[PDB]
Design a protein around this ligand. Structure first.
Ligand SMILES: CCC(=O)Nc1nc(C)cs1
Length: 185
């Protein structure tokens, strides 16, 4: 792909984070803590899952960023509407305002309803995410495999401003403590 020139500097929004997440000083890394991180509750925080939003809101144009997923066993990445549900249980689907892929139990899937199997020969250490607001496109790229395409959501109905979306995943196994990191431009 040749989307690199639409690169945007994403930072994480502390106020949206699940209360167990630890966001770095530079707001570019997030990991699961082993306990509640001693923050007050608010209506923005994802309550049920280890999720956080980027601070940036996008309503037009083309945007590209990269995320490091090295040594994680489970995670979700993509974009979502600014008005997604924060409290209780929900599925990741375009009907609910999410355009995402994930790793779970040694398989990669796109968050369609129902979910779609992805075909990845080279397990990615870094994922590229491309959004074309006007075209209604969200695409995912395998940076470890020379930028190969992972998945394209097309005919997207965003229906609002978009925010970068992250889930570091639970760490029941002791094998998923590693952070998600926003990679430099
Ligand atoms: C990826 C295409 C898409 O956005 N489909 C949607 N389904 C509904 C029903 C809302 S958005």
């Amino acid at each position: 792909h040749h989307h690199h020139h639409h690169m945007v500097h994403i930072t994480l929004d502390r106020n949206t984070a699940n209360s167990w997440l630890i966001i770095s000083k530079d707001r570019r890394q997030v990991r699961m803590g082993d306990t509640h991180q001693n923050v007050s509750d608010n209506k923005e925080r994802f309550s049920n899952y280890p999720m956080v939003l980027g601070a940036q809101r996008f309503s037009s144009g083309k945007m590209y960023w990269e995320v490091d997923v090295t040594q994680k066993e489970a995670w979700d990445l993509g974009v979502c509407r600014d008005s997604v549900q924060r409290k209780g249980q929900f599925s990741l689907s375009p009907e609910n305002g999410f355009w995402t892929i994930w790793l779970w139990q040694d398989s990669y899937e796109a968050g369609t309803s129902p979910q779609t199997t992805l075909h990845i020969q080279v397990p990615p250490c870094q994922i590229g995410i491309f959004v074309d607001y006007e075209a209604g496109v969200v695409s995912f790229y395998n940076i470890t495999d020379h930028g190969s395409l992972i998945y394209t959501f097309s005919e997207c109905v965003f229906a609002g401003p978009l925010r970068p979306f992250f889930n570091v995943g639970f760490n029941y196994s002791g094998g998923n403590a590693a952070p998600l990191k926003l990679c430099p431009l």
